[PDB]
């Protein structure tokens, strides 16, 4: 909620935050567990 706090504090209404750490963790998880990979795609 840090980005939400920043948006509530100092404007920034159009900067869409790309959390690349979450995406990389999700990709590693999908690679690690074939069940999640099967259900996701």
């Amino acid at each position: 909620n840090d980005i939400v706090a920043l948006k509530q504090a100092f404007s920034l209404p159009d900067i869409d935050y790309a959390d690349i750490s979450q995406r990389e963790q999700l990709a590693a998880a999908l690679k690690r567990w074939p069940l999640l990979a099967e259900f996701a795609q």
Partner: protein
């Protein structure tokens, strides 16, 4: 003899007197004091109706509201104090065509300038000047309570008119051309004040319109995002201070295919090499150590291959949003070659640590990184400040890398980039926090290095007279360089009244009333205008304290360059020598002035008062400076940041309890539990921290339990746990912005009261230790009289 007392005095009153006498004897109070107190009590109760329930109800909460009066500690002249406080309370209150538009602007501007010239150059009689003063001051006060930028411009213009009037009056009808001694020093003061006026005008121009640049959103596709290389140059810092920087860098929300983190080591230390190998970041240890940090960065550039280079200091930890909040503009402006980010210090600065005002007063550097750089942004003069910046490598290769000539290499390379046509930008949101200087000596030294570098740039590159560079950029750079030549004017200001008081020399040949009616509006309007402009950046009357701390140490090196873990509390005598010398000179001046107020000519009655109030202001400033020079206790290995986050604690038996994190450091946390659920001073505890919707677990050991408050010590963490902890405590993109936004506004009167208390505290501090024994007695006498007066306000 008790029978006689019992017969003469009613037994209740006799018992009251005996009990009060015994109580004051047990407390060491004199018997005569008890007799005088009883006499005052009886004479009051008979000459003052203390039976009125109104006064009884007032007395009920008198101790809480007025704790400065003790009923069990009689002192001489207590009724005088009671009457004085009562008198204070009773006194106190409880569009269009091009040619036509240009001609209209011309006529409006010339009319306004003619009116301003008339206002500046109108001689007055004292009553007329006073009416003018009250009217313009009221206009300023009204415009103060009007948010926006138009009000700031109005205050700037009003202040400029008042200051120009003051300078006109000084240059016309204050210089006394009669004496060879009342001339040189008077002109010296006039030149000091003209320099101060020029600095004020250039500062008003510099922050006339902060740009308030906003981040530009990055493209949705992640394949258009550029490659960034992060450099962390280290020379002698311990690994404990660079670990957090590296961990925060490893958690930056940037694609790892396009982010390389480098550790640059000029010490050739093997611990840093092993740490880089363990965490997976790059490492360079150059064999030849030349040009210091600039040379290290150049050698790193010789190997790094990335579109952008971001330089971080060892103690500066970036937030995960740094690159996303920064890189937008580089893809929007192809001419951009440098972006700057504010410097925040979670560690307490020497002023904040020593003077006890850490979260109350704003930091010394938040005026610069909060308003001055934003003002420079408009004129394209935002210069590199060492850390928290991004430089495009293609422009940086054309200029031959980081400039290696001056000791302030960042400003020099930014100046070169601006002189080659490239622009610069500034982003206001604090996305990196560092460690402040651990002592006053460190602050003095770093300021000296900065000033030496700026004067070197002024002498070598000379922004005023060079090659292609806009005039606004020239003005901004020369203002930044002139900021560090203010030591000599400050010394003149601190030593000016001592001229007249010691050696009769009329610096200003005008009646004291006219001096009060002309100098005072200048100061009042400057203070109001700054308080509006630099509102939540710097409190009033504090800039003089910093200036006087720096002046004696910055003036010599700047002039020469122009020509060519606190175990115990202590006072830095070596640092504080100039302040003590100036205090001695000013107080010997005030003794001479006290003599002159009686044995001098009667006509010089108001002039001596003016000189004495000047000396008193000087003494307050120097006392604050001395108060800075006493180092408070510091036994904490890591500095703590006060942040409130909900959390949870896990025990080994499987019970979980909620807690509120109140502060965190590198190796510990401080939490509060409503009721002290279950914890003991050695038990291991798992700490649950949430970053958004994700929860992280960190092993901890309890160090202190004091009721609701519990201190935790972090267990040896793995690399991933270190990264998660940094992302949950330090590298959060909300702590520093809200920290800066929580700074209280500027209240000039409260600020004056705080500075007066600080000076008194510094005098009391020096009333304990003394380098020259003789000074001990004088300091003790001053403190004694001062607290006696404080008790009799």
């Amino acid at each position: 003899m008790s029978i006689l007392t019992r017969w003469l005095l009613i037994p209740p009153v006799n018992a009251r007197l005996i009990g009060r006498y015994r109580d004051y004897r047990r407390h060491g109070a004199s018997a005569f004091s008890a007799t005088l107190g009883c006499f005052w009590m009886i004479l009051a109760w008979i000459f003052i109706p203390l039976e009125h329930p109104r006064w009884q109800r007032i007395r009920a909460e008198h101790k809480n509201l007025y704790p400065h009066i003790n009923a069990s500690r009689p002192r001489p002249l207590d009724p005088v104090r009671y009457l004085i406080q009562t008198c204070w309370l009773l006194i106190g209150a409880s569009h269009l065509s091009a040619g036509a538009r240009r001609l209209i602007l011309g006529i409006i501007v010339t009319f306004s300038l003619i009116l301003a010239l008339i206002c500046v150059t109108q001689p007055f009689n004292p009553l007329a000047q006073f009416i003018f003063l009250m009217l313009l001051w009221g206009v300023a006060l009204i415009v103060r309570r009007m948010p926006g930028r138009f009000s700031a411009l109005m205050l700037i213009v009003l202040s400029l008119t008042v200051s120009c009037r003051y300078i006109w009056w000084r240059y016309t009808s204050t210089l006394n051309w009669d004496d060879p001694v009342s001339l040189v020093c008077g002109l010296i003061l006039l030149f000091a004040e003209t320099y101060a006026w020029i600095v004020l005008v250039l500062g008003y121009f510099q922050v006339v319109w902060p740009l308030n640049r906003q981040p530009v959103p990055l493209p949705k596709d992640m394949s258009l995002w550029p490659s960034v290389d992060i450099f962390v140059p280290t020379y002698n810092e311990d690994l404990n201070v660079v670990k957090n920087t590296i961990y925060a860098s490893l958690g930056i929300d940037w694609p790892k295919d396009k982010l390389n983190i480098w550790i640059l080591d000029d010490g050739g230390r093997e611990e840093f090499r092993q740490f880089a190998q363990n965490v997976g970041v790059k490492y360079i240890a150059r064999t030849t150590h030349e040009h210091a940090k600039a040379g290290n960065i150049n050698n790193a550039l010789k190997y790094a291959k990335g579109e952008f280079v971001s330089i971080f200091d060892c103690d500066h930890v970036p937030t995960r949003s740094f690159l996303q909040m920064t890189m937008g503009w580089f893809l929007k402006e192809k001419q951009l070659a440098m972006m700057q980010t504010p410097h925040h210090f979670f560690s307490p600065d020497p002023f904040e640590r020593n003077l006890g005002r850490f979260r109350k007063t704003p930091n010394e550097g938040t005026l610069f990184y909060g308003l001055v750089q934003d003002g420079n942004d408009m004129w394209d003069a935002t210069f590199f400040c060492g850390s928290c910046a991004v430089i495009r490598r293609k422009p940086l290769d054309e200029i031959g890398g980081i400039a290696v000539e001056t000791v302030t290499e960042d400003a020099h390379t930014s100046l070169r980039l601006h002189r080659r046509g490239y622009t610069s930008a500034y982003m206001r949101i604090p996305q990196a926090a560092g460690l402040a200087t651990e002592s006053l000596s460190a602050h003095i030294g770093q300021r000296i290095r900065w000033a030496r570098g700026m004067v070197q740039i002024f002498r070598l590159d000379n922004p005023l007279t060079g090659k292609g560079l806009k005039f606004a950029q020239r003005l901004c750079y020369v203002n930044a360089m002139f900021h560090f030549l203010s030591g000599i004017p400050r010394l003149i200001f601190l030593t000016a009244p001592l001229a007249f008081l010691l050696l009769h020399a009329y610096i200003i040949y005008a009646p004291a009333l006219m001096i009060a009616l002309f100098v005072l509006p200048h100061m009042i309007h400057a203070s109001l205008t700054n308080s509006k402009i630099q509102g939540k950046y710097r409190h009033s009357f504090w800039s003089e304290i910093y200036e006087t701390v720096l002046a004696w140490y910055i003036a010599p090196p700047t002039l020469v360059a122009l020509i060519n873990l606190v175990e115990e509390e202590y006072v830095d005598w070596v640092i504080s020598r100039p302040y003590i010398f100036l205090v001695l000179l000013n107080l010997v001046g005030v003794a001479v002035g006290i003599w002159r107020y009686f044995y001098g000519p009667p006509t010089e009655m108001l002039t001596v008062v003016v000189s004495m109030v000047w000396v008193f202001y000087n003494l307050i400033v120097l006392g604050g400076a001395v108060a800075v020079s006493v180092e408070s206790k510091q036994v904490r290995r890591s500095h703590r940041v006060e942040m409130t986050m909900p959390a949870a604690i896990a025990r080994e038996d499987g019970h979980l309890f909620s807690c509120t994190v109140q502060d965190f450091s590198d190796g510990g946390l401080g939490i509060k539990i409503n009721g002290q659920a279950q914890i003991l001073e050695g038990q291991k505890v798992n700490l649950l921290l949430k970053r958004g919707q994700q929860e992280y677990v960190f092993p901890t050991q309890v160090a202190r339990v004091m009721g609701n408050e519990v201190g935790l010590k972090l267990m040896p963490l793995t690399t991933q746990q270190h990264i998660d902890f940094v992302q949950c405590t330090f590298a959060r993109a909300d702590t520093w912005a809200l920290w800066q936004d929580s700074y209280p506004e500027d209240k000039p009167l409260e600020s004056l009261l705080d500075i007066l208390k600080l000076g008194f505290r510094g005098y009391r501090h020096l009333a304990e230790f003394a380098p020259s024994s003789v000074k001990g007695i004088f300091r003790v006498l001053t403190s004694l009289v001062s607290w006696v007066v404080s008790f009799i306000p």
